[PDB]
Structure of Alcohol dehydrogenase class III:
Amino acid sequence: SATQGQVITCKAAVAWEPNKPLVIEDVQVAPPQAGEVRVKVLYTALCHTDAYTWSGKDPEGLFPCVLGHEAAGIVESVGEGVTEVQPGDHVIPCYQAECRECKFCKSGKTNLCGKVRAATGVGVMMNDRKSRFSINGKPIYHFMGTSTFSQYTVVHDVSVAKIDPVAPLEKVCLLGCGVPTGLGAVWNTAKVEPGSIVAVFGLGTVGLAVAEGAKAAGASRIIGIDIDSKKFDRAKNFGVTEFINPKEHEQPIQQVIVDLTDGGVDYSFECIGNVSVMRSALECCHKGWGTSVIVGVAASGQEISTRPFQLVTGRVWKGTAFGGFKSRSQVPSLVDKYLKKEIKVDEYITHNMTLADINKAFDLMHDGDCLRVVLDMFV
Amino acid sequence: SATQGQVITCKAAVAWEPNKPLVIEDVQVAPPQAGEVRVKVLYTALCHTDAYTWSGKDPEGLFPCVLGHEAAGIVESVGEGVTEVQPGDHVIPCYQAECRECKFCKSGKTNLCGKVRAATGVGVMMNDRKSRFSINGKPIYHFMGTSTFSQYTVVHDVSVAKIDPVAPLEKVCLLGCGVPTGLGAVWNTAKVEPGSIVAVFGLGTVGLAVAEGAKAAGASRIIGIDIDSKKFDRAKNFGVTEFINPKEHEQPIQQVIVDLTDGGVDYSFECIGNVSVMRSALECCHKGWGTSVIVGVAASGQEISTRPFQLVTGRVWKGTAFGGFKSRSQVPSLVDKYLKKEIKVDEYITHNMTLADINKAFDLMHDGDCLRVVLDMFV
Ligand SMILES: [Zn+2]
Ligand SMILES: [Zn+2]
Ligand SMILES: [Zn+2]
Ligand SMILES: [Zn+2]
């Protein structure tokens, strides 16, 4: 092509400083080296994680950087040795890599591959330990090995999920984080059986995907917990059957749940990232078999606590990262299901904006009322 | 019999008040009421749980009381409705009941039957909410629903395990607590697979049962961890393949374990009851799948803490209560395995003494250099 083996100059939302507005810049995107894939990002969605690193609260946050991790697009070019994808292929860049060969990938116990982890965590590429982004010949850090707030991005081949070309890229971009995290918290991590009584803390995108997950798992009761009653009405469509606003109760929320569940829930899922709520999600679980899955990401230097009697008496404490899904092997399968009308994707999108409206999209996310905000990159 | 329907006067070691020595007193043991079983306790073993309540550190402790929960005996008589056991039957009285019919029993997810817990926790019988023991017409509280430090005890039928009459009762008394707790933590709670790498924190009786359980489960590495290096030699025989004394390392124990196992253990078992060591057992577990099982009972008020990223990144935190064994269905099975020479029982016994030697036995527990001490009740 016209850009194959060449430096690309494109539009990118750059986070120059933490807690400052994002500026749409003109950026140089280097071609892909060995094991790398240059992707044309057509649509990108904002996740609370981008805002967290943006705020300045993330200790692993490196500035200046190109944020974003939830996106879909097309392969512009591939580096040396890239065989699974070719130019023109429809793809989903994934923050969680899948080499298929390491200790983690060679076991059916996890999805947490660590092939590219070190590089990605420091805003660079594995092959040369450098960024593929520059403004005035100076580097701009990558983020989560994705950096989807740039029209053109360079990602490792092991983090490129090849999807059905007939699938709509303005919807499927969500299948890169929030939605699979929720579905997978239920299907892969918890393995919720039919008839199960479920508690969901937080009715945001992930909490709503945990609700769809539980409904598909054949849960008899999906209890939704949120300190904002406005979030209840929209939750019903996602399978939530009962609701509790902790603010309307003087006793701890776990105690309220235990009274409505006859000893507690079979499975609880905390989708806020609040350590105090993580404790409450554990304690609301039924004695002997109750299982709490931490879905939400908590702030650095904050601990979860409980009395060990809670675990001795049969409760289980676990968590999920990208809902246990293997990016390359399983994200295309999630796209096939959506196309077969087996799973929901569209229903999580409330807003469609343009890349130039990035700060307006961030504004809507800080307020917390909305669901997903899909940005059209080429407008 | 000469005692059927009658009040028995026998010997019992009675703890009149905390931390003071035990007194061998003559007691009135009332006959069994409906659903009750009167047992001739021939042999009783001492557990750290008896010492804990005896010390006065137990908020649920009620004095005066007859301690003891590890025993084997013969059924002297039964109350109305008792059909499972009959006079002369060899039995193990269990602190964990198994009604075979409640919510917990009807599920294959737990061994935590709660039918008799409302009475046993307050040192009484369910039928009249009163103790079956008295000295000078004054009640002596029951303990753990077993009170095995009395020559004769009255227990709920749902706690009476019917065993093989050829089994040595001076040996099988251990199958009432410690040994099954360790064996089961591995086989039932954790479900340790062949080739697994195991860490055992605490090389006492329970830790040694975990090691034996792990060895039978086909674990490739059994790492023993104890601050007392004198416990290492004897542990080998029980299956422990390597040892770490944390006093010999300036770095945290979890750090030392990961460094020696390439990311951490597959399963860790904390058999000390120390909340700081519980945190170390979780954090020494491998990313993606590592499962820590709390076996040791911590003191009241104490809390376990960790950063939620540990669970988000694949670690599992759980606990075991009597090794997840269902008392009446499974204790006979363990006795059969001991008779088949498939499990160790004898090897956990270091001393045999008499009921009059109870205070000497407790002195031996205080120092903690010994394994199990068995008291011959009729000498
Ligand atoms: Zn891998
Ligand atoms: Zn995300
Ligand atoms: Zn029961
Ligand atoms: Zn015990």
